[PDB]
Amino acid sequence: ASGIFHLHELPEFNLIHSLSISDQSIASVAINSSGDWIAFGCSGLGQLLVWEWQSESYVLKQQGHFNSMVALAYSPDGQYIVTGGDDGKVKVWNTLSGFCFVTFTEHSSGVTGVTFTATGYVVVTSSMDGTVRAFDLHRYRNFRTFTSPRPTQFSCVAVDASGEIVSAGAQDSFEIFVWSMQTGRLLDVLSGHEGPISGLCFNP
Amino acid sequence: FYLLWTHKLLMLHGQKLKSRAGTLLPVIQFLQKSIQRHLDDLSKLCSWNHYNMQYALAVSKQR
Amino acid sequence: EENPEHVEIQKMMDSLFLKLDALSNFHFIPKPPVPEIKVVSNLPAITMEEVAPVSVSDAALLAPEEIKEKNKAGDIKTAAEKTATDKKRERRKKKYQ
Amino acid sequence: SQVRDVIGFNMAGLDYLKRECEAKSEVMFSHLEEKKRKRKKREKLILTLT
Amino acid sequence: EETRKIPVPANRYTPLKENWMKIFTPIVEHLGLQIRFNLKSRNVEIRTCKETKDVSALTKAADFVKAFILGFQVEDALALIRLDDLFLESFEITDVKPLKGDHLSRAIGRIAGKGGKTKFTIENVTRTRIVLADVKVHILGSFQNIKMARTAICNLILGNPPSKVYGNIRAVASRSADRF
Amino acid sequence: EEQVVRQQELDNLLHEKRYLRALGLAISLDRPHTVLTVIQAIRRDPEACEKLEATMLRLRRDQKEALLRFCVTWNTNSRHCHEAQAVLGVLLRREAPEELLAYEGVRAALEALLPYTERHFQRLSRTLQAAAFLDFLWHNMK
Amino acid sequence: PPKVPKSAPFFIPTIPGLVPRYAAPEQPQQSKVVNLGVLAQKSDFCLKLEEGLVNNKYDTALNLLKESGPSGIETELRSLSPDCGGSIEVMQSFLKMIGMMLDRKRDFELAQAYLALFLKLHLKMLPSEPVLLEEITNLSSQVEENWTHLQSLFNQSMCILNYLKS
């Protein structure tokens, strides 16, 4: 129940080694015919793990929270999909393989919107943290972060086709914030709406 | 084989497809990424042989 | 980390705040991000990826300028080569700073 | 092509010399202290908005 | 009823004595065999009986005593009975290369190393137990793990520097147990 | 008085357009920029270009150590990379790999040389992709 | 890293693997203590390579090479070195294997993939031994002419498609 598993050799009861998988309990366990691979499932976070004990390494390890996902985007090529969830994690999946291959945890609260740039392999997210962060896939780093002068929560993100302009809208301040990609300063605050902004989109 | 087919049709009809390039965007995108995919891995591997082999062929000469 | 009381108080804040924002359905006044310094190390970018038997992107994980810093001009001149104007510019900049 | 090939030939040569230097390092690997020094050498610092 | 007898020399007579009960107990209790040590012939005897239920015990008993005579610990030799895959291997040093006198003495030095470092280093990476008695080298382990041991030892005999020997085994043994 | 005598000879050789001989002295005087200007002048001239590798072999060992660390700075600039790569080509092909390890500061120099080389190779690769447009124009020619 | 108890014994049960890299594990109630010269000392891949020299046929070795996984392939090529117990004659067989796949022009990506790994492993031993050079000179020409024909066809396709975009 504590999330640890033990290995033993039964007739002598010799503890080979033990691991801790997660804070949640381990619901189901299975071993293959050869005996090299052991399968673990944790329903607390929906985490699946395949463990090779002789090599002391993971073959597969995935985690996805239930009802977490709220966002979607495609790469311009159509080869990758980036999503964000209420948990606050940004995940990139490869549609051909079907597995996630890079995950960004820089955001503290949930991600409301996500978008790819039209040309580069750059993914931009907006979160309830009050931050809009841009990540590159060449070096896997959060190279630019935009925040409002006023503490406000963003609900969506929109980026121009050229990629120079980044824009976001708020839950409460009722005004659209527009920043520059290369410089990173607040270009302007667009006002005139009354009530929260439901959505934004740039003309392609 | 399909590389030769694509090369011939493209080199023959590129100018005519340019005028109606607006309505053919979902097709070209598709084609492009496919033709991209294979290419990249070959460009990673073949060159990694070629120059390296040449480098070996260099050392034997200086000896 | 060396003050047990501050550690104890911080854990109480964490439990309480995660309870409080849920009641508001995640509608609170955010905390502005503080700038910090982080350590990146010079090794291939595969290590940041998830567990997988194949690697999609191969890179240094670190920019070429970061590995070796380059001057604005991109060239270096020894004191012997420096002409009259070059020494004047360096004097002007140093007084400017 | 010729300009690319000259750069390409330097790519292969430099990579081989890179592997030889890394091969020498394994010989010295007190092992923990040597590994700590190697890791400390390859650590750069960047600005980040946390 | 059949019997097999295994000799013991002078340098291993005493270790058999304090550890006689350690070797005696598993065979009679688990393998169900009758054991005698003839003082005159200086030779240990194993035989079957009515209480022996399995025919493979005679082979395992002969190997278990053999490893102890060679200079292996009782618990390490006991693994032979419980584990089928373990093999014990023995070759002479002069087989790989003909060396005489001082050059033969230096060859033992390269394998053993100052303070036993080289043998101890190969021991961990290959997960094999090595007993070095002059021109005869004994290795105990698994079939794959024996090869990494013997490859390192033979390369050491043939004059290769030890620094290269550690590197090649470490590279190969890292990828040995990946299993696809 | 030694530098000014050596300086006087260098200026004469530059004035006489004797870049091949002037290459040796400017390296010993530790002039990276002057050598860089000399290397560019050599490659512009046809006959001097082929005799570049022959001259580089005649240099003594410490001149090769100084020249190798000159290439690190030149390779950083995209405008100056081509002659930097040209010099590195002579080093890799003529000289023995085990001897390259004997150089001083080669380990630190090797760290910076790789990342900028990958950038240059990718940039030339995209030019080759654009250069294929010449073939497309040729078939559509009337 | 996993927590290991100190009291744990040295020997733990072993699973040989999904595919046998070594052909023969052992020669019902036979002995388990043997001298040298009995246990297998050559990999099944190395055995097939030796036979390939005589008959100029490497299809049998090819099938093993395309069936073993990347962890297995790296081990097999590492074993091919003289230090690991493979003769320089046997390495000549593997080079001739690669050339044959280029003449048939089938399994093209495997030819580049395996040859690239082999170059990475034994580049330092390579220029010293003269026999391996003649294989390379044949190999270097074939990879050059094959890639250049394909690289042009790839490049003309992409540049036209980009021109349609703008």
Short mmCIF file of N, CA and C in Angstrom, two decimals, chain C residues 76-90, chain F residues 31 33-34:
data_model
loop_
_atom_site.label_atom_id
_atom_site.label_comp_id
_atom_site.label_asym_id
_atom_site.label_seq_id
_atom_site.Cartn_x
_atom_site.Cartn_y
_atom_site.Cartn_z
N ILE C 76 39.22 38.61 -31.65
CA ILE C 76 40.08 39.06 -30.56
C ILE C 76 41.38 39.58 -31.16
N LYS C 77 41.82 40.74 -30.67
CA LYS C 77 43.05 41.38 -31.12
C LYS C 77 43.98 41.55 -29.93
N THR C 78 45.24 41.16 -30.11
CA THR C 78 46.23 41.35 -29.06
C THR C 78 46.61 42.83 -28.95
N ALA C 79 47.30 43.16 -27.86
CA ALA C 79 47.67 44.55 -27.61
C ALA C 79 48.60 45.08 -28.69
N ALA C 80 49.41 44.20 -29.28
CA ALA C 80 50.32 44.63 -30.34
C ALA C 80 49.55 45.08 -31.58
N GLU C 81 48.51 44.35 -31.96
CA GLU C 81 47.75 44.69 -33.17
C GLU C 81 46.90 45.93 -33.00
N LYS C 82 46.52 46.28 -31.78
CA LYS C 82 45.53 47.33 -31.57
C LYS C 82 46.03 48.66 -32.11
N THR C 83 45.23 49.27 -32.97
CA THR C 83 45.56 50.54 -33.60
C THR C 83 45.20 51.70 -32.68
N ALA C 84 45.38 52.92 -33.20
CA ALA C 84 45.08 54.11 -32.41
C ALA C 84 43.61 54.16 -32.02
N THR C 85 42.71 53.99 -32.99
CA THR C 85 41.28 54.09 -32.71
C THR C 85 40.81 52.99 -31.77
N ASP C 86 41.37 51.79 -31.92
CA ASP C 86 40.96 50.66 -31.08
C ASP C 86 41.26 50.93 -29.61
N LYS C 87 42.43 51.49 -29.32
CA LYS C 87 42.75 51.84 -27.94
C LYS C 87 41.89 53.00 -27.46
N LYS C 88 41.56 53.94 -28.35
CA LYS C 88 40.69 55.04 -27.97
C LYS C 88 39.29 54.55 -27.62
N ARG C 89 38.77 53.59 -28.38
CA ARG C 89 37.44 53.06 -28.10
C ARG C 89 37.39 52.36 -26.74
N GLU C 90 38.42 51.57 -26.43
CA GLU C 90 38.44 50.87 -25.15
C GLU C 90 38.54 51.86 -23.99
N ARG F 31 50.36 37.19 -33.34
CA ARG F 31 49.38 38.09 -33.95
C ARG F 31 48.27 37.28 -34.59
N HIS F 33 45.01 38.28 -35.40
CA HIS F 33 44.27 39.03 -36.42
C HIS F 33 45.10 39.21 -37.69
N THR F 34 46.39 39.50 -37.54
CA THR F 34 47.25 39.68 -38.71
C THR F 34 47.35 38.39 -39.52
#
